[PDB]
């Protein structure tokens, strides 16, 4: 009634927030998953990195999980907060 049915995508806000919460919960409490975020912490906190740091970070992330899993390159740019996500599933192997 308020939005003239333009707010229909907000009908499941509780369920989507619950699913996000569940995904965060299994994000810290899974083996071969939390150390990837720890590596992200070390990469983000330690700035002024060259390219070779980026490839060794890539294979160090790869070595944590299985050889058949999928990698995702979620690029962030401070200027413009533009998150480009790239599909490199079984590409760097």
């Amino acid at each position: 009634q308020a939005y003239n049915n333009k707010a229909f995508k907000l009908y499941t806000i509780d369920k989507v927030t619950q699913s996000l919460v569940k995904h965060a919960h299994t994000l810290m409490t899974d083996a071969k998953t939390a150390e990837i975020m720890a590596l992200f912490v070390k990469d983000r906190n330690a700035s002024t990195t060259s390219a070779k740091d980026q490839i060794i970070y890539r294979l160090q992330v790869r070595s944590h999980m299985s050889n058949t899993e999928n990698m995702f390159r979620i690029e962030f740019d401070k200027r413009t907060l533009h998150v480009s996500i790239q599909y490199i599933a079984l590409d760097d192997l």
């Binding site: 390219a51 999928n70 995702f72």
Partner: peptide
């Protein structure tokens, strides 16, 4: 080839962090 004061930051992730970030977006 040192990139000082970097602005583009890369997150490498499996399906779990990707799906979590997709739900956030």
């Amino acid at each position: 080839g040192i990139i000082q004061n970097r602005s583009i930051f890369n997150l490498f992730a499996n399906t779990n962090i990707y799906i979590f970030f997709r739900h956030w977006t």
